Amino acid sequence: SHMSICTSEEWQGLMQFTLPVRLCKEIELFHFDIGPFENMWPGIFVYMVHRSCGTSCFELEKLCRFIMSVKKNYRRVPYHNWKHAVTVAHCMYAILQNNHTLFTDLERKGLLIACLCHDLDHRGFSNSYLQKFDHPLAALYSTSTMEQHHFSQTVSILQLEGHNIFSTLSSSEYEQVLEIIRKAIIATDLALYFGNRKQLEEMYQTGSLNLNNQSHRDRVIGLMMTACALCSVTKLWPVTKLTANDIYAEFWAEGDEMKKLGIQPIPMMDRDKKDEVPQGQLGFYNAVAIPCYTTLTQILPPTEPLLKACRDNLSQWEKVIRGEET
Ligand SMILES: [Mg+2]
């Protein structure tokens, strides 16, 4: 399937990697920023998998090959890259650690892997772009185009020799974890978030939400995936601000291509309309981020720190709009 594969030096190096003692405590916190520790990113993921799922959950050799090959199949784009993948996986780790027994062993291992793989082989182009210009991917995947591709990429990596970390699961559990991963990755398509959140909010307010109901579990997991995928808005302001720079760098490049195809891009993707960014961020926080973390906190009380951090960043964008930026 034209997948990149890690080298022996790469996965063997990870196998011997040891995570500094000081970071063990930091990694448990919601606001942890992996940014200053690039060389340790693969190791941080191994650590989280081991703490959440156990050191024997996966054959170590296979897990290290899987991780280093996943890294190699993320592209050098400004935002939807390897750093983003590990950042999202860490948010999931923090959510799971704080709500551990609400999720099964199968779900925790599937969700950590889904987060690491949720944007696999992203090229820096949105579903809007692929569908507007009839990219082959849009023909193959009519909706949630890039997300269906990310899942396909995930399965392709598992299919590489010695990379299938899930093979030791019974045939029933194997099928189940692949479905958990497929649904989780598809849920990262923000187009689906709006309806999912509205539904969950109503089930919560009316008291019909039932975690013993599979469809309800699927929706809760979907909201968790959205929360993790957007977690840059829950970091300390300087981190959130720096990440916004990368997000827009990617958007502006897409907008440049649209102009070449004769189409005016939306203002958010127009590098000649940067003055509109602060209000654009306000709109995103009000329509997507705040409601997401608000409903997540209602369903999973321990995730409240994400909501508090999101609210703090909304306030920061409001300060920018008032001309108080430093
Ligand atoms: Mg995505």
The span from the CA of 154 to the CA of 119, in Å, is 9
How far does the centroid of ligand 1 lie from the alpha carbon of residue 324, in Å?
Answer: 32
Confirm if 114 and 184 have CB atoms less than 8 A apart. Answer: yes
322 alpha carbon – ligand 1 mean position (Å): 32
**Contact indicator for 261, 320 with CB cutoff of 8 Å:** no
Task: In whole angstroms, give the CA distance from residue 36 to residue 57.
Answer: 28
Other beta carbons less than 10 A from residue 55's beta carbon? 10
Question: What is the amino acid identity at position 153?
Answer: Q
Residue 172 phi/psi, 5-degree rounding, is -70, -45
> Distances from the Cα of 101 to the Cαs of 97, 108, 154, 304, in angstroms?
9, 10, 26, 18
Token representation of residue 3? 């997948």
Q: Which helix (H) or strand (E) holds 63?
A: helix 60-72
For 32-58, the DSSP string reads ---GGGGGGHHHHHHHHHHHHH-TTSS
Query: Distance of alpha carbon 206 from its chain centroid, rounded?
Result: 29
Catalytic residues, by residue number, are: 80
Angle at 289 between CA 182 and CA 308, to 5 degrees: 115
Closest CA to 116 of 168, 79, 68: 68
**Centre of ligand 1 from the C-alpha of residue 147, in Å:** 6
Number of other residues whose CB lies within 10 A of the CB of residue 90: 26
> 39 φ, ψ to 5°?
-60, -20
DSSP conformation class of 207: T
Technique used by the depositors: X-ray
Q: In the numeric block, which tokens belong to residue 98?
A: 């704080």
Structural domain count, the chain: 1
Contact 251, 270 (CB under 8 A): no
Q: Are 94 and 108 a contacting pair, CB within 8 Å?
A: no
Distance 193 CA to ligand 1 centre (A): 12
Question: CA nearest 281: which of 319, 322, 314?
Answer: 314
Residues spanned by the domain of 194: 1-326
CATH number assigned to the domain comprising residue 118? 1.10.1300.10
User: Quick one: resolution in A?
Assistant: 1.5
**Ligand 1 centroid to residue 148 C-alpha, Å:** 10
Mark residue 68 as left, alpha or beta (left: phi above 0; alpha: psi -120 to 50; beta: remaining). Answer: alpha
What is the Å distance from ligand 1's center to 189 Cα?
A: 6
Rg over CA atoms, the chain: 19
End-to-end distance of the chain based on CA atoms, in angstroms?
Answer: 48
In the reported structure, the alpha carbon of residue 137 is separated from the centroid of ligand 1 by a whole-number distance in angstroms of: 14
Give the single-character DSSP code of 31: T
* Nearest-10 crossing angle of helices 277-284, 304-321: 150
Question: How many A from CA of 232 to the centre of ligand 1?
Answer: 14
Cα separation, 253 vs 256, in Å, equals 5
